[PDB]
Design an enzyme around this catalytic site. Structure first.
Site, short mmCIF file in Angstrom:
data_model
loop_
_atom_site.label_atom_id
_atom_site.label_comp_id
_atom_site.label_asym_id
_atom_site.label_seq_id
_atom_site.Cartn_x
_atom_site.Cartn_y
_atom_site.Cartn_z
N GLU A 35 0.82 -1.22 0.00
CA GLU A 35 0.00 0.00 0.00
C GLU A 35 0.86 1.27 0.00
O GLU A 35 0.59 2.21 -0.75
CB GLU A 35 -0.95 0.02 1.21
CG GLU A 35 -2.11 -0.98 1.15
CD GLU A 35 -3.16 -0.64 0.10
OE1 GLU A 35 -3.16 0.51 -0.40
OE2 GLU A 35 -3.99 -1.52 -0.22
N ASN A 46 -7.52 9.32 -5.85
CA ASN A 46 -8.43 8.43 -6.56
C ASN A 46 -9.21 9.19 -7.63
O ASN A 46 -9.23 10.43 -7.65
CB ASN A 46 -9.40 7.78 -5.57
CG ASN A 46 -8.69 7.05 -4.45
OD1 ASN A 46 -9.02 7.21 -3.27
ND2 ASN A 46 -7.70 6.25 -4.80
N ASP A 48 -12.44 9.52 -8.15
CA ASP A 48 -13.62 10.23 -7.66
C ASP A 48 -13.29 11.51 -6.88
O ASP A 48 -14.20 12.21 -6.43
CB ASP A 48 -14.49 9.30 -6.81
CG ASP A 48 -13.80 8.83 -5.53
OD1 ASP A 48 -12.63 9.20 -5.28
OD2 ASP A 48 -14.43 8.06 -4.78
N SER A 50 -11.37 11.62 -4.02
CA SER A 50 -10.88 11.28 -2.69
C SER A 50 -9.38 10.98 -2.72
O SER A 50 -8.78 10.84 -3.79
CB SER A 50 -11.64 10.08 -2.12
OG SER A 50 -11.39 8.91 -2.88
N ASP A 52 -6.09 8.76 -0.56
CA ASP A 52 -5.66 7.73 0.40
C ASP A 52 -4.43 8.24 1.15
O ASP A 52 -3.52 8.78 0.53
CB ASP A 52 -5.31 6.43 -0.32
CG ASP A 52 -6.49 5.78 -1.04
OD1 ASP A 52 -7.66 6.12 -0.75
OD2 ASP A 52 -6.25 4.91 -1.90
N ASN A 59 -8.78 5.99 3.21
CA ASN A 59 -9.48 6.78 2.22
C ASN A 59 -10.32 7.90 2.86
O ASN A 59 -11.04 7.69 3.83
CB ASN A 59 -10.33 5.81 1.38
CG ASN A 59 -10.95 6.45 0.15
OD1 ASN A 59 -10.85 7.64 -0.08
ND2 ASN A 59 -11.60 5.63 -0.66
#
Ligand SMILES: C[C@@H](O)CN1CCN(CC(=O)O)CCN(CC(=O)O)CCN(CC(=O)O)CC1
Ligand SMILES: C[C@@H](O)CN1CCN(CC(=O)O)CCN(CC(=O)O)CCN(CC(=O)O)CC1
Ligand SMILES: [Gd]
Ligand code: NA
Length: 128
Positions: A35, A46, A48, A50, A52, A59
């Site tokens: 990750e 991301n 959309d 958002s 991380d 998120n």
């Protein structure tokens, strides 16, 4: 901060991640490697809108507030910047809520694709 493998394993154990909801410690160390490359300051956007954050790439859509994900939730009750700290307390406590939500560690895409169904004990092998 970029953690060493055994350094992170020891910190996660101290904070009670070993066998949390039945996931042995090796699962969590594997997840962190793929990750974030063990880096507390990792961020990724991301599609959309958002973002991380941190060592377990939590998120902003549901879990923390970054002030630029309109209509989102903050279920861990923290600013997302708290997940970038050298102290992993906030990340671990928020991850405990996530893994408890019904989907287990499948919430972490890298875990499902690269850790699930493997010898995960290898990730803590050699550590004291
Ligand atoms: C506790 C977690 O469930 C929190 N959850 C955020 C809060 N909301 C609404 C709510 O869950 O009360 C999300 C709504 N949504 C679908 C749905 O829930 O019906 C996304 C699903 N996931 C996980 C899941 O649902 O397993 C996101 C995490
Ligand atoms: C809106 C939908 O979420 C409806 N939902 C039914 C209503 N309840 C409680 C509630 O959702 O307020 C379900 C409880 N439960 C998970 C949970 O909610 O914590 C089951 C999972 N799913 C969906 C999901 O939650 O991901 C079932 C569909
Ligand atoms: Gd949900
Ligand atoms: Na989950």
């Amino acid at each position: 901060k970029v953690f060493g493998r055994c350094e992170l394993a020891a910190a996660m154990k101290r904070h009670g991640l070993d066998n949390y909801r039945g996931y042995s410690l090796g699962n969590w160390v594997c997840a962190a490697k793929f990750e974030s490359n063990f880096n507390t300051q990792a961020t990724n956007r991301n599609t959309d809108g958002s973002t991380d954050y941190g060592i377990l790439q939590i998120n902003s859509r549901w879990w923390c507030n970054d002030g630029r994900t309109p209509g989102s939730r903050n279920l861990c009750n923290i600013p997302c910047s708290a997940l970038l700290s050298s102290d992993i307390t906030a990340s671990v406590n928020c991850a405990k809520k996530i893994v408890s939500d019904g989907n287990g560690m499948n919430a972490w895409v890298a875990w499902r694709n690269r850790c699930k169904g493997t010898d995960v004990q290898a990730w803590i092998r050699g550590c004291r």
